[model samples]
Target chain A: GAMNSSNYAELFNNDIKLFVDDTNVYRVTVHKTFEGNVATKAINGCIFTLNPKTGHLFLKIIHTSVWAGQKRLSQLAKWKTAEEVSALVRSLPKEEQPKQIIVTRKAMLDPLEVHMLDFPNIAIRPTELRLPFSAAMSIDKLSDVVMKATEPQMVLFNIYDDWLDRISSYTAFSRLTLLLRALKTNEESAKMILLSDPTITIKSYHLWPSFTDEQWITIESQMRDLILTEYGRKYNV
Target chain B: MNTVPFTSAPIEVTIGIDQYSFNVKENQPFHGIKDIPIGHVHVIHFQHADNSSMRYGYWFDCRMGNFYIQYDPKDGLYKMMEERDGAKFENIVHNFKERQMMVSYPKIDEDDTWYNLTEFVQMDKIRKIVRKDENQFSYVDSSMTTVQENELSDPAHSLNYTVINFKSREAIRPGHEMEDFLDKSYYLNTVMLQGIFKNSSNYFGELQFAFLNAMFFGNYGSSLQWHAMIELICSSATVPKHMLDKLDEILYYQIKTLPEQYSDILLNERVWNICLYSSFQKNSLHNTEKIMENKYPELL
Candidate 1:
């Protein structure tokens, strides 16, 4: 769950105007913050800021001292402290300050650390950004599907990348099941979409050959049940 | 298509089978040289009792231009084999150079005539063919079709009966011809099979073909690669025996003919893309429906 130290450093140099000294102290030179509105684009782990005043948008993962100084400290000494981050927020131009700041808790940073910044006008939103397995569905839509689930649906979790990794973890699997259950609304349509993409299934096999016969049976049964249910719905047989 | 206006002298090509030798002009294209009794080059397939995989070896076709006779341990016989000629030969010699004008004096060696055909009689599951003079040959499947050895006059005499002592001679060097030929043929066959697999609307066919393609082209060693493919084909639940047989037939014909058109293309990106696209197309409603109805009916 630790941020890649090099990536954090690169982001610090390129996007944020924040700097760290040799004594592990941080300072902000300029505040060119942009609000991530409806046009905010999420790629990999970073969210892009699409404000025209900033000219171009770039976002990256921020690291704290616990994980930051392990490797790439040649550019900077330490991560921004809560007090320094709060002070930086206070220094920002009224129009330039972001109304809300999003952070991926547990995976990236502690929610308490960000909440301690305590900017009166700013809202610190702690959110978990999980990677979307299906390329066919957008991340936001997938998130909505996970939240709005009612019943079991026909799904092709086997075809998704990192599917095994996600399913093996209790938290990730619980989250994924919710999303899969939401697919019940248009189960047949979802099955058709998944059926048309054999590469996903083929890739799943290639990626995880160590899956036991029982595990494969479980997966196959789940998919089979989904398809057959859809078929029954279509044919009434 | 642009035609190159070039011609060459009719060089004499000595056709030899064991002790007998006949000379023919090489200037004529493959189709032009005809009416000479074409003998069967039998490919006998064998499966080890302990292993699920199948291996095949062949009796040398004297007419096949590129292959040389080599001792294949799998066959336990001196069989006809070809080596891969490399990408350079495909580009310069086969594709770019003008066929007739490209002249190189080839020395005919007496050793080239030595081919071990007698071993075919010893090998089991021999797919036999007897020449009925020129182009026509009586084809017989020992397992399925009735044996028609009586159709040919003196089948033994027409066949090469020379008993070759393989140990006495120098080892037969396999040229790049066979590997190159097989590589191109496999690529061509896979692309063609992908299309057929999709059209069949069979999920099992698609999966089997995908597995075959992946294993065949995957980074596995040569010996293991083919055995893995054959094993997958035989063991797959979705692929029917007839489809397997059809694939075998297609590969056999492709290897036998060694089409020049395929040689020119030779496993390019376009071929790979088509195969990839067809593999994706395997997810159609027809395939999904059948897979659910027959293979996974327990879910219902």
Candidate 2:
């Protein structure tokens, strides 16, 4: 007999596990064949752990790195008290702050460290993965092209402008913050300040931080430039 | 597998659909095109990977005149296509690959305005009339008379207008795709009020009314108003600069116009709640709140 909505709701309450031992764990291996030496890397991850009892499987990111990433993400969740992390850094010596203060928030981990960790065997290949695979050499040069092509700004703009729905909450906010920072206007300043303050409601937080109504007209023009152009061409408002 | 760290001078690639010069006027039925299917394949080569062509294809499917997304890993393209029933598929993708490369179906003589994607692909390729092109992907003007345009002028008139056409009352898809749009995407429904107001100075007052009417009362025709709005705004070139800005305003008007109905729309808050309760059993919000308080004492 199938359980009704209420019965299913109450059946397996709060017993969700992300990674179960018995559950199958799928690993996504991305093999990008470059010139010279081919590099292969893998990210072994899964969404949720299945419950053998009721056959109820939860849907949530449960990889170890993902869990740690999610934990660190909480810091960015509720706006950090103004300069709270900075204050923590200030407590330590300037030289020690970089090492002691871990900036493993969504911005750092998912895009930076996690990306590197997951794609470790990244190297130039011989035949199938050989470089100049298209007349390109210098893994450094190739890396430069790929990295620059996928800059945070470009990637975020593409995400916001083209593939907005596919993005995650952390990524959306991170991109929003990045755009505001890049523009360096009053509205962006207000957003950063508002984020720092806990009392401000999210609705009140201006979508484009630090931008004035009048200024935004011009800023909108500048934003369009970024959206339409693949290159993040700097524009004066 | 070329996992070379991608780094190079940023190239601004504008990959989107440019507006088609349609013969149909606003508010009038799109009677010009016959048997026009509402779907398209927009492929953009964002950047060529040195020598290899790393193209990104967006497969836009208007299933029974509705939009759906499909992921095509083969082409590294985010495929958006229409699918009816969410379970059964007609396999437009299969046809696309068999032909190989970009395939655009020319408009049939019957319908001048709307392009016939199906027949165009099947017959034209066989007939050798249309050749398979390299860069350009096929697109059909899916805009039909069903979506009323006169409502664009007056925000007041827009309050009751249906923005999306949902054949099925339930969500189109129940899995990850539904959750994605419901949570992060910002939907903006727009009406090209510029042409109307610009052409007629005498109808300024009425045009203002029309603009406001369409802003508030205008309906895209389904429960998926937000989704439609976002897609429209992203693809529109008329007001490209203030895309988000204009969208924010439009969304504000939309929410305000139909507060009761809009409120019913589930948001990220609901998603978080569902995730929390389904996982933690008890109220995870409070527990998480308590933990935040202790971990970041200053934040409290």
Candidate 3:
């Protein structure tokens, strides 16, 4: 049955407005006031807060796992719309109307650095080309891949303008897409094989390439947005 | 109606009984698109032991490095064996970039779960090195703010947001203490797509090619900034138009050939989006089945 747009009553049902501010031990602080609504002015409500730096995990519901109207849970159940929001907030007994809402999460600091290992081991798979000796003198040719990514070892850590996108095994991704495209499979079928692995190197005899500071700034901006949007969604950050 | 244009070479073919010849041009074998019915999602939620109630999901993809004991005793060093380094220059370089690009979304502890990757010692040493001297490592100052969730929903703010809100922050961040849930499958797909796009373009599978084309152009991320970079370089303040036009030839090799790590440092948002992007899709079912909302009787 088709539903009327005017039927929406809940506001801020799933809107977790509290930001995990790592500014101090990952304090979960309400950084903004919930805006947009007619019957109401401003709503500063209670939210989950992570105060201690003791490093503990907190839980928050992503709210409404339902998929409908061509939408996922991304848009929270709370704050449906103005009238949609107002109908619920205003019609509710005055005692029940939302007035203050602040929230929070958990985070920590390390006294020592044991997360990374010293030089570990590597495998030499053959490749087609080499970085010039001058480049070797400068940056060098190219490199290797995965381990128990859970316990990854470090070989290179070149900091080229804050672009450190490293992980253990990425080929599981390559093959999954490969199988999906090849077999005409749905994502559920393809996703199952993603924990496994293998990848490659496409070398060059092409042309001169150098990233100027400005160009790099542009590219890095893309990467950060990409990371935030991508990571923020899955991690609920 | 969607065509992938490669202007295939014309080939002559003979008809069966009629004995007539015809020339046909083609790029891909299949004639049209087969839209996959996107699957529903089941994102993992965490009341992680540390008291953080976080919901996380993403492809589990990683790049790592290795070092061995080339020297002995008290300060044992894990590094490339000098003897082999000279002979295996190419191999060393590949491995070097692997370590160079070594970074992780860090936790204070020492483990990388299905959703996390731990920091290793080599990157620790490198970060220290960069921290001491950002100039030496090319970790320059940033002129942008971390993009937020609200801006994403508002097109008015999102589209016109990049007007240069320069901030002062260091460039190189090792084992960045940024929070990310994680997407094992989708993340893997995005990077792997980039990998194929770069390392073996000619060898790309038909479906893979189409998937990548659909994926990258689908984003409103880096491309906008890419346009910005192009504009900057074309400006007299930055570089000349003549110099700018040549970027295409130069970047193809670099962009296509470089490893994903060497290419980008932050979350590979393009791929990360796919992880997020993949979940937002579901096929239109022919059957009319109403859905439940929590324990309530609201039909969706």
Candidate 4:
């Protein structure tokens, strides 16, 4: 039938696999994540975007390329880097240039390869899952300066005023990041969100019957404290 | 002795509840309005070619309450109906050859949706295969759905399984098609969320509570929360001036296995069918023979 609870105690394990499926089903996570994790460096994926209209610079977490295969990855890596993107943004008329470059982890969007990049500034995600036999978003008409692709599949959009008036303040980049954060928070609400999405499901463990809610609270608090005490700057502070 | 099953007239069949008629040479196979059954038949067509219009695998027209099948060799089978509402068409699909059955709340009162399909002709004892019309398909959702894909059919021996055939869900059928709402990012959000929730439901079964426990405590994964998230993600993620390539598959990563009551819902074959249809929303024009060759190599 079922095993003894102490067998679970004896079975305590070690392996990063333990956390692999934590994102188990996935991302665009909601808040409850850090609660108050406002560390200036509390970010992993630092995406950058600038608002041409409000001139507000923002930094969020985003990985621009959703591409999977090698060839496409190669092309994206070659040209869609922070240096090239920066140059393009600099190319905008002097007046449209960002006054400040907002950042999430506080790092300027300087790396050639980083976790995320909505680097084309105001480019939004796609609206029309846009199908019935079509992509939600596709790119064309090469003349525009801001229209390069991270990939037509992850398709991009420039923040527009008409759309913004309805939901004020956030640029497409800001808004998307906001949603991703909200999804994470929502995930926390689910608490059911996995440790890993896009990975093997058996990768993580939950201490339900054995570790029990009692010890889990104790263990969780200890780990949180452990991480903070020893490596405060290294983790979610 | 085999002289003439040939006819220069039409035929109709009825069982008093419904009726169907097709022309052989128009001798009229019994026609009264809705006053019928599988009704009756009048036969009069060239024997050599037997151009008789067999309803099997054939797509239908935009009659208000009629239903039709949208089939493609590459994708799967779908069911759609023009509802009495006159405002929407309902959709569902069966991927019998594969894993799931999918149905989407449809929008096709405009009724342009049609497809050429694999038709069947019964001559004496053998059932032969044929093709008619352009091959195509579509997908979408509903509350009152029943499904049994890759399983036993109950009727006589086994209920006859058909192809991309459409017979209305309602005794009487549609009152609808741009789908501004089923946008790509929106789909990504949903496809992603469903995958997430499915994962939640799959593991431990206890996590369902772990995940949805947001009262004032932040119960954000609720259906209402999902609705709001769908809107926020869709509107905010709007990437204007481009349409996603129809051939592209949404990055909907999914995994399924023997379950523990929780994911019995998401991991359903029926759910997968609809998910495939909607996720592969634009990729519905593959050849039926291709599908048959792959799925039912025996059929060919």
Candidate 5:
């Protein structure tokens, strides 16, 4: 499928290595606010990283837009100010603020004096801060789970980390696992149940007082066992 | 022969009592250890999907001689909702960390499936047996009384046990192959099992009581990191010695084995890059202060 990109293979094969250019790296903070009929919220944050020499900023915005449009929209709204809007024809954060900023139509051109052209009803504001790729590299070292998974089944072990970070509970994590498992086994109809219902909360399996530590251990061991026993065996390439 | 130790009260064990020679749905998710015949005892790993494959719930039954169910999401919640009642369902989800609990329901989703209490062995009996002795314990599943006894005695001897012995009018298909491939019922069972162990322990230490609740009942998922991290903290606070010992053991063995395993799969650089990039993002996100201030302030 075209979806599968071999770009990674080329990069890996070439053995490209990147080291942080200490001078180029900087800490960038972003603030975003979103006010619209669909959603309303304000959020701000800072990130530190090593800025690569290439167009890393472009990649960051594109990727952010694809994955987290909501977050980007909020950022554009937060930075709108009268002083910064006058410089650009569009509402945008001050150029001094960061190397990359995504301004939604609502980003105030001039808070003190409303601009003549006002565009609302748009959503999604995204911004980016350039730091050294080296800094980002540092953070990546600690979070690689699938690579460090102890057993084949442990592939899911590292995935579990991401799930816990994003998904709400153990049950929610389980549902996704179930979905993937079903997908793997070709249980297409069953997969629909998971997709059909958005409210299904898989909540953690730990709350019931009736459950004990021993049972919990049993379950983990069993999961690992299955991963080892199955996966990659039947679908041999 | 294999004896597992528990640092605290309530020793839980899950034993798989499958009839040998029977072509069960024992493929993919259901793994029997060591090429250990159909009925032979081996560790089984039930990989219950939780939170969209982000975490997992696991159970290990030493007596079963192996891990039994993978508890994929299809089997986790669907199966549990099929078998469980009210309080049991609520109790199961409560064990996950606060974040897990918060985004659990998306308002548009279905009620988490409940487990069938009648089909399972009494929870009290499981607790009683474990509390009574650290050695091998026994219980009768009126459904498999005679067969279970013989299977436990000589599980590896042969695949001679009859399906009738373990079959109940309400018994869901014992094996996946036996059921129609096109059937949704098959998928439902898988999801229920997934929910069974979504949050078995917190940070792999100090058991999350709620996860244990779900393990036995239903509703499982993939989210394990937050629960594991939370458990790691709780264990450090309340059971420091045990937690430390576990960490030492995991570090000693896991460090050596994990890198080797990752090496094989990360053949290409693109996949590797995604793996690396995600890892970096997660680590940065894991910083408690950053996560709290930027993501969820209420958690802080």
Candidate 6:
């Protein structure tokens, strides 16, 4: 069942800082300096949300990489300033705030460190978003999670830079191909949303050391053809 | 080898539904040797025999010195009926076999405008007609030639060619069995845009539209549009040559690397957002250099 409408009212009862309308999923990443300090004063991340019924996709990048001061981030930071995040939440639309926000566990240091109570106006308790797969998860386990996640007729898979970089390996690529094949076999409707810093330059070879240019091109071409062909079949285009 | 003095006169032959004319130089020494000298050979033009219209016709190879007709289906018919001096002797088969040509027909596309008979006609069909004649009489009707011309001209009809096995020369089959199988597999497995946009002119307008939209609307995040812009800039007459060389490298690297690092959607959206942000900046208004720098600072 959908959460009560008062959920938003109670969530935003206090002095809100960030207020956006109709947002749920967020792909967050923190950039750190050489000494392991937050590189940018502002929180660096992007907000992605899709209304399945309406098929509306909205994205907002909170902090620009240009303002990071350095050409690249020295290290990945797990902790984000709570005050800045609260401020972003305050900017959300009063009526259309999310019932649940989905984010990766790796992106945050301690889930309990920051809660709705941390904000002046919000007083909701935090709950752990259970993920079936983790960093140590096997390809089979990951595939299982992916299958279950996409069991819902319309499923959206959102990934941040950390996961994107992790999954760019040849092993991962093969596993992903297998997963896609499974999804296609089951006839599930799914869309993958990926986020990365625009300033960073990374290639298939960088992720998968043994990956060849020809192989990568072949994989991409095959994947694209598969998706487009399926889309043509479904829509009769 | 014997150099025989011969009178070089215009020779005309009616084969099938077409009449071909060869203009030979007057009073030249004709050589009957293993190989005919290219300088002594006159190229004959084959045209529709009727006085209906003069369209471009097939180019025929005529070696006046040999005085023997040697035609390969790969090339058109050889030997004019009137010039049949060495037609009777069965021992004259030496020139016939020597002039045998091997040709391979390429896979035809529906949009292709130009057609070559040597490349399109089947080798066995040509051989069947050639085998019937003893020396000089290879009777080709104007009506049969006209039918072939019409069949080729019709866009709806697709003609099949015989695949010849080089090793045995005996094995002949209709259509390129291996070639067709390979082509079908490629079409099924690969997403090739080359079929749709066959030439530069076909993709020119779409590229122009995408480029203009990216420049004006600042929506650089569309991978399709960005790809079109890069292809156009590299091939079409839009970008300055000086900048093209460097831009090609930058665009190629970005396109190849970005997809692996990020989602196509995320990368394009970010690029678009960056472009949008740059547009609002006070110093970068209508400045292409500034826009480029903002979007891809590494390239600059």
**lDDT (10s digit) by residue, model 5, range B1-300:** 222211111112232221111112322222222222221111121222222231222222343332222223343321110212435423432334322312111112242111111112232333332232332222221112222234333333211112211112222232322121212232222222133222223223212222232222222211121132232222221223443444333322222222233323212333223322332222222233232234322222
Which tens-of-lDDT digit does each residue in B1-300 have in candidate 3?
011111121221111000011222222121111111112110111111222222111111112211111212343211121223434433443353333322222223442221111111122222331242322111101111113323334332221222311110111122321100111122212222233322222112221211111122222332343332222222212222333333333323223322344333322334322312232211111111111111112212
- Residue-level lDDT of model 3, residues A106-128, one tens digit each, is 11111011111110111111112
Q: lDDT by residue for model 5 over A35-120, one digit each (tens)?
A: 53353322221111111121122111111221234334433322222212222324333332223222312232122122211222
Per-residue lDDT over A1-237 for candidate 4, one digit per residue giving the tens place of the 0 to 100 score: 111344422112221000000111011234543677532211122222434333232322224333233243333332233333345454566555443332222122223212113233332121111111010011111112113323322212332323344433323223333323333333232223222233323212211112323543453444344434445455645
Clashes of each: 10, 94, 68, 83, 128, 22
- What is candidate 6's TM-score for chain B alone? 0.20
DockQ of each: 0.01, 0.01, 0.01, 0.01, 0.01, 0.01
Reference-based TM-score of each model:
0.17, 0.16, 0.14, 0.17, 0.18, 0.17
Candidate 1 residues B1-300, lDDT tens each? 111111222333332232233343445331111112224332222222333233222233434433333334464332333434545323433443344333222324543211222211211112122223322112111121112222224453222111111111111112322222213322223322353323322323222322222222221222122232333333222444455445444333322222233332222333223222333222222333343334323333
Q: Give the TM-score of candidate 6.
A: 0.17
lDDT of 4 at B130: 12
Q: Which stretches of candidate 5 lie over 4 Å from their true place?
A: A1-124, A127-237, B2-42, B45-60, B64-202, B205-252, B263-300
Best by TM-score: 5
* lDDT for B200 (candidate 3): 21
Looking at model 4, residue B112 earns an lDDT score of 21
Model 6 lDDT tens row, B217-255: 223322244443332232222333443444433333333
**Cα lDDT over the full model 3:** 0.22
Candidate 2 lDDT over B117-146, as tens digits, reads 111222212112112232122221112122
What CAPRI-style quality would you assign to candidate 6? Answer: incorrect
Worst 10 residues of 4 chain B by lDDT: B169-178
lDDT of 1 by residue, A1-237 (tens): 222444322222222222111111221233333673333221122122211112122222232322333443222221222323344456568665555443433221322133233444454443333322222233333333333434322121232234434343333233333334424435555445444534434332232223334554554556556657766888997
For candidate 3, give the docking quality class from DockQ.
incorrect
Looking at candidate 6, what is the lDDT of residue B59?
A: 19
Candidate 4 chain A: worst-modelled 10 consecutive residues by lDDT: A16-25
- What local lDDT does model 5 show for residue B137? 29
Interface RMSD of each: 35.5, 15.3, 13.4, 21.0, 31.5, 34.5
